[PDB]
């Protein structure tokens, strides 16, 4: 089972923190979005476009649950996985690091050409605020450590992580 599960909105640093925390802990990183693409042979965008979000969430839940059982390193969950009650259930007992980010920073960090079915223009900031407002309690409900990625150098936030995993609380 994972040493740590990372959750948070798109732009919260899951891929990069993932990478640094994993190196620090000395194991592999698995991103459940990547795992979904590997298992299905499909892009996430095609699943959303052609089959819809609800089908995506069921697939995702299955993959997340498998990963929680079979992966031994750092696991990063796609931003919306926590909207699935079964995903929340499966996370019980695990170490769950919530990467918290404000809307301004998250919006800036997600504005390139990455395809994002649930975060595409116009009014991307409005869409980001809506995801944040809805998902905030869900992230909080599952997390065991929360770290602020707004301003600290990643390498830093991670220190809050390696150190924090190690001592009581
Ligand atoms: O915020 C979301 O719900 C998503 C985030 C991505 O990681 C992908 O899992 C997908 O585009 C859905
Ligand atoms: Cl790594
Ligand atoms: Cl899901
Ligand atoms: Mg990096
Ligand atoms: Mg894709
Ligand atoms: Mg299916």
Q: Which atom of ligand 1 is nearest to the CA of 131?
A: 1
Q: Ligand 3 centre from 90 Cα, in Å?
A: 11
Q: Which CA distances in Å does 143 have to 118, 124, 153?
A: 23, 26, 21
* Residue 127 belongs to domain spanning: 1-169
Shortest-distance Cα residue to atom 6 of ligand 1: 78
Which residues touch 23 (CB under 8 Å, ≥6 apart)?
none
111 closest CA partner among 134, 100, 127, 98: 127
Peptide bond preceding 122 in cis form (omega within 30 of 0): yes
Helix axes 154-166, 14-25, angle to 10 degrees: 50
13: domain CATH number is 3.40.50.300
Separation of alpha carbons 151 and 147, rounded Å: 11
Coil/strand/helix, residue 148: strand
Report the domain count for the chain.
1
DSSP H/E element including 36: helix 32-40
Q: Are the beta carbons of 74 and 29 closer than 8 angstroms?
A: yes
Which residues touch 76 (CB under 8 Å, ≥6 apart)?
5, 6, 7, 14, 15, 18, 29, 30, 31, 32
Separation of alpha carbons 64 and 34, rounded Å: 11
What technique determined this structure? X-ray
Question: This structure's resolution (angstroms)?
Answer: 1.5
Q: Residue 50 class from Cβ within 10 Å (0-12 exposed, 13-18 middle, 19+ buried)? A: exposed
To which residue do tokens 């809050």 refer? 160
Separation of alpha carbons 84 and 72, rounded Å: 23
Q: Ligand 6 centre from 38 Cα, in Å?
A: 14
Separation of alpha carbons 110 and 132, rounded Å: 14
Q: Are the beta carbons of 146 and 98 closer than 8 angstroms?
A: yes
158 closest CA partner among 57, 37, 29: 29
Q: Are the beta carbons of 49 and 120 closer than 8 angstroms?
A: no
């Amino acid at each position: 089972a994972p040493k740590a599960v990372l959750v948070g909105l798109p732009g919260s640093g899951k891929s990069t923190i993932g990478r640094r925390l994993a190196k620090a802990l000395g194991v592999g990183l698995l991103d459940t979005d990547v795992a979904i693409e590997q298992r299905t042979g499909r892009s996430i965008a095609d699943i959303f476009a052609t089959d819809g979000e609800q089908e995506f969430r069921r697939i995702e839940e299955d993959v997340v649950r498998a990963a929680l059982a079979d992966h031994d390193g750092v696991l990063s969950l796609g931003g919306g996985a926590v909207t699935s009650p079964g995903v929340r259930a499966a996370l019980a007992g695990h170490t769950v690091v919530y990467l918290e980010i404000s809307a301004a920073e998250g919006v800036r960090r997600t504005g390139g050409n990455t395809v994002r079915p649930l975060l595409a223009g116009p009014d991307r900031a409005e869409k980001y605020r809506a995801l944040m407002a809805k998902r905030a309690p869900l992230y909080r409900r599952v997390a065991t450590m929360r770290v602020d990625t707004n301003r600290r150098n990643p390498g830093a936030v991670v220190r809050h992580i390696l150190s924090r995993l190690q001592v009581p609380s």
